[PDB]
Design a protein around this nucleic acid. Structure first.
Ligand SMILES: [K+]
Ligand SMILES: [Mg+2]
Ligand SMILES: [Mg+2]
Ligand SMILES: [Mg+2]
Ligand SMILES: [Mg+2]
Ligand SMILES: [Mg+2]
Ligand SMILES: [Mg+2]
Ligand SMILES: [Mg+2]
Ligand SMILES: [Mg+2]
Lengths: 45, 86, 108, 155, 161, 46
RNA sequence: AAACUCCAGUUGACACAAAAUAGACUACGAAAGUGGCUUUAACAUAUCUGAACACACAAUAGCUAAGACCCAAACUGGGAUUAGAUACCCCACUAUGCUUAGCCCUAAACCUCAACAGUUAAAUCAACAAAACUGCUCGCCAGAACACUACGAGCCACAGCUUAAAACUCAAA
């Protein structure tokens, strides 16, 4: 059960990272992400 | 195995005195440390225990020698009283 | 540097021993060695039985080859001494004379 | 029943509890096991150096593995004999040496088990699949169930 | 490149009449028949003659830098073959740090000698990083996105104007 | 002095020309490296 | 008692294992560590201090692939044992101890003495430990427990390792 909670928290952390990254280019004025940009999954093996 | 036999740890019997030859062989093996090695090699002695034992034996020898030297040095004084009465 | 090769050769007759000595010295020179002297210690019973090249030896001829060789030759020479079938045991050491005899004042 | 604290936890260890071992699966595919409370060692009149746990067993209406007890015992013991290694290292000791590599792969393929799963991470359904495939193998080979790799290594 | 094997030892190079000896003597007194340390000494002497104004003064910063550079080269050659020698990896890294410190001192003290040393010994001086922090995965990813977004914004502004 | 000593010593080195002669001479020779020491510190050669 | 009797004794051939005596020595290395022989490389710095995170290392245990296997041995079997036997004795045999290439990064990792420089005059000095101090620098600590914990963050680790609190409670520790 500690595995499930930890994996859910890792998903939440990845979502937070993506959301901050999105905030950056939205504030920069870009309607979409830079061409070819894909947020990597850095919190999963 | 690869060595010549009847040279190492070999004692000759004199006048059929087998007992004296056996006891001399025992003395040789004891003073060469072979007996202690055989007795110690029956079971494995852990390295830390071996180190502690060696240190204890060395320091016991040193302390005993120092105490014996002190006693021998102060034994010269032990004699009849030359100023008895006073 | 200066090296000493201690060679324990098979107990053979004079012609075979001479040929083996020539072969060893030729290998030394082929690897770049300058040989100083070849020295005979004699044929004697080995301190123990030595099994070399699928043959057991109890006696052998002791020889000393003093030479100067490059540092790279030594290893190569060792390999050759492993393949020669008439060598019971060959070992290269730094020549004892090169080591400095440091002087001592006695026991403190 | 009362057990020692460690044994009670091993009996009541979930998939991914450090006390997960043979006893956990062995008790849990047959019984609902509940480690209720623990009694410290100071409470026993000659005081031991260990604690005491109280475990409650309720037999399960539908056992989670429909197999003979001794077969499941062998499978679980061979799985858990190397508790920190990959599971296949434990399953491969169920078969003779000659057919070891082939039979281990066959068992894992038919059972649909990831070889990189460790013993402590294997749920009771994985053990169900492994036990079923091993039962089929033993039915196809009368003398497989009597194999003891230590006796083979004796020779 | 190393000195040729026929090079004579530093100890036997100024002996009078050393050109009048037998070829066997020349080989015996050469680098071919000595350990690596003599060859390193010859390298150090060559560097000193090439770079420093007074090749005899070994107590100056430039001479020490040359000696440590020779030692660093020797450690690199050793570690090329001995990949798992942790002690000599440590020695190489510590020697590089010490040479960097000496180079900083020389640059702050004597720029002409510093430049001559850098050219002669093939050393490219690098200034230290200002901050020492871990560049973890999140940080590098976010930095790369920031650079990409800046480039895109530059393109958009260029198009606008 | 060392260079001169090496010069004089090189004349006696073994070469490809004198390999046979020196090998046979060695085979006709024996050297002893053994010697003993007494309690008084005196060398006793064999 | 089980076990073996393809057993045991002499003799001969024969390791990818670990290294009597020396060593009553106290050496090498930054530490961890290092005690069979030969050879090749080789043990930084001509001020000092300077990091949980930067850069390189870290006993034993543990994990990936391949390999070796004498002996030892967690577990696993069997033998013998009272009246809940011996966990402890005996036999057999695994992971592991070994090598190659990667991980993991913890120890009573301790001389339980932070690094350099200096002094022995003082009152020597709470106690014990290991005689008492000075100068300078970095690191760390401010009642107990909660807590080698929770959360956050990072990590070849996915339970792991590092950093590390708060609420309630007590007059103590
Ligand atoms: K200690
Ligand atoms: Mg420093
Ligand atoms: Mg800090
Ligand atoms: Mg480690
Ligand atoms: Mg290991
Ligand atoms: Mg084994
Ligand atoms: Mg072990
Ligand atoms: Mg410090
Ligand atoms: Mg924690």
């Amino acid at each position: 059960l500690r595995r499930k909670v930890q994996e859910g928290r890792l998903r939440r952390k990845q979502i937070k990272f993506e959301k901050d990254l999105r905030r950056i280019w939205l504030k920069a004025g870009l309607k979409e992400a830079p061409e070819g940009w894909q947020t990597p999954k850095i919190y999963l093996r | 195995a690869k060595h010549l036999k009847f040279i190492a740890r070999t004692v000759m019997v004199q006048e059929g005195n087998v007992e004296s030859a056996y006891r001399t062989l025992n003395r040789i093996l004891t003073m060469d440390g072979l007996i202690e090695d055989i007795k110690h090699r029956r079971y494995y002695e852990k390295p830390c225990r071996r180190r502690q034992r060696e240190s204890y034996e060395r320091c016991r020898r040193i302390y005993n020698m120092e105490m014996a030297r002190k006693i021998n040095f102060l034994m010269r004084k032990n004699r009849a009283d030359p100023w008895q009465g006073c | 540097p200066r090296y000493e090769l201690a060679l324990i050769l098979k107990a053979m007759q004079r012609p075979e021993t001479a040929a083996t000595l020539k072969r060893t010295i030729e290998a030394l020179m082929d690897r770049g060695a300058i040989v100083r002297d070849l020295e005979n210690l004699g044929e004697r019973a080995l301190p123990y039985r030595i099994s070399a090249h699928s043959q057991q030896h109890n006696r052998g001829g002791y020889f000393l080859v003093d030479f100067y060789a490059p540092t790279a030759a030594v290893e190569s020479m060792v390999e050759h001494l492993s393949r020669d079938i008439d060598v019971i045991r060959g070992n290269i050491v730094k020549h004892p004379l090169t080591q400095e005899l440091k002087e001592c004042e006695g026991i403190v | 029943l009362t057990f020692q604290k460690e044994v009670a936890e091993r009996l009541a260890a979930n998939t991914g509890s450090k006390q997960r071992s043979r006893l956990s699966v062995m008790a849990q595919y047959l019984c609902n096991v509940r480690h209720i409370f623990t009694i410290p060692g100071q409470a026993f009149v000659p005081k031991p150096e260990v604690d005491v746990g109280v475990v409650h067993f309720t037999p399960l209406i539908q056992p989670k593995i429909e197999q003979p007890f001794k077969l499941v015992e062998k499978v679980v013991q061979n799985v858990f004999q190397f508790r920190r290694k990959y599971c296949h290292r434990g399953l491969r000791m169920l078969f003779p040496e000659a057919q070891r590599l082939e039979s281990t792969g066959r068992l894992l393929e038919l059972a649909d088990i990831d070889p990189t799963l460790r013993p402590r991470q294997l749920s009771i359904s994985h053990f169900k699949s492994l036990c079923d495939v091993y039962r089929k193998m033993c039915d196809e080979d009368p003398q497989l169930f009597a194999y003891n790799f230590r006796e083979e290594l004796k020779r | 490149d190393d000195p040729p094997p026929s090079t004579l030892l530093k100890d036997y190079q100024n002996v009078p009449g050393i050109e009048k000896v037998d070829d066997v003597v020349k080989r015996l007194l050469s680098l071919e028949m000595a350990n690596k340390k003599e060859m390193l000494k010859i390298k150090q002497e060559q560097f000193m003659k090439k770079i420093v104004a007074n090749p005899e003064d070994t107590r100056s910063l430039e001479a020490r830098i040359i000696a440590l550079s020779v030692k660093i080269r020797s450690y690199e050659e050793h570690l090329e073959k001995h990949r798992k020698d942790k002690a000599h990896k440590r020695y190489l890294l510590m020697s590089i740090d010490q040479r960097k410190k000496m180079l900083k001192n020389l640059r702050n003290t004597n720029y002409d000698v510093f430049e001559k040393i850098c050219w002669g010994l093939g050393i490219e001086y690098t200034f230290p990083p200002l901050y020492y922090r871990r560049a973890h995965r999140r940080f590098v990813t976010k930095k790369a996105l920031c650079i990409r977004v800046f480039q895109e914004t530059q393109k958009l502004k260029k198009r606008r104007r | 002095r060392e260079v001169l000593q090496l010069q004089e010593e090189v004349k006696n080195f073994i070469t490809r020309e004198n390999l046979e002669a020196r090998v046979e001479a060695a085979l006709d020779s024996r050297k002893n490296y053994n010697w003993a020491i007494t309690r008084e510190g005196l060398v006793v050669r064999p």
